[PDB]
Amino acid sequence: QDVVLGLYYMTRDCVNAKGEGMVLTGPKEAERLYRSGLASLHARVKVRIT
Amino acid sequence: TPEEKLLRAIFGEKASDVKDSSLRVPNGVSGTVIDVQVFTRDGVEKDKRA
Amino acid sequence: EIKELLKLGDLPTSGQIRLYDGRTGEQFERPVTVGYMYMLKLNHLVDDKM
């Protein structure tokens, strides 16, 4: 229960709302999430997947 | 046992023909005594504390 | 009438309220529910059950 709602909340693509497709490379995005500005359930957005 | 007989002989016998069966507070719990009570047998030397 | 009681003393007529982490101090994404629930400590409990 607890963890799964957790990972479901980590997906669930929400349109715009501090979204926009500002692209980067994985781990750097983590700095983006903590440092606000961008939301988390947006937007969609593109990044480099290795 | 012989070894024990030697042992008390080295540290003082005092081998009383008595045992031990005192009421002790069980390991773990802890609190404060709020009331003691003594019901003496009808025909028994009542105690000082009693 | 519960909403009606949410006024008078001034309170968010939704039960919802935005909370802050405390560790990070950062706000939680969604407004959580905050109120007063009459709880009671049952018997059973530890110490005994161990």
Partner: protein
């Protein structure tokens, strides 16, 4: 006292002997953690055989489940009280109103 209640718990406490309800309503003469004495006042008995009504109220005793069952005075001295209201409270209750 419990916030969200039912109004019923004021009955539970006083219906149970756990709480000391005034036998005859009058005026409190002496309050104490040890006891409470009330002076009948408004209409005593048929004989003029003294007013007063003494309530000893038990304190800090053990329960069948080893829980502390003790009574506490919720009424102050020199306060008027009628017949059938809480003078001394009990364990897990709040002046007439039950609190678990």
């Amino acid at each position: 006292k419990p916030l969200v209640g039912t109004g019923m718990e004021r009955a539970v406490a006083v219906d149970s002997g756990v709480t000391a309800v005034a036998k005859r309503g009058g005026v409190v003469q002496y309050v104490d953690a040890s006891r409470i004495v009330i002076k009948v006042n408004e209409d005593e008995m048929y004989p003029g055989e003294a007013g007063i009504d003494i309530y000893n109220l038990t304190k800090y005793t053990r329960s069948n489940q080893n829980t502390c069952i003790n009574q506490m005075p919720c009424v102050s001295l020199g306060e008027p009280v009628e017949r059938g209201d809480v003078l001394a409270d009990g364990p897990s209750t709040d002046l007439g109103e039950l609190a678990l």
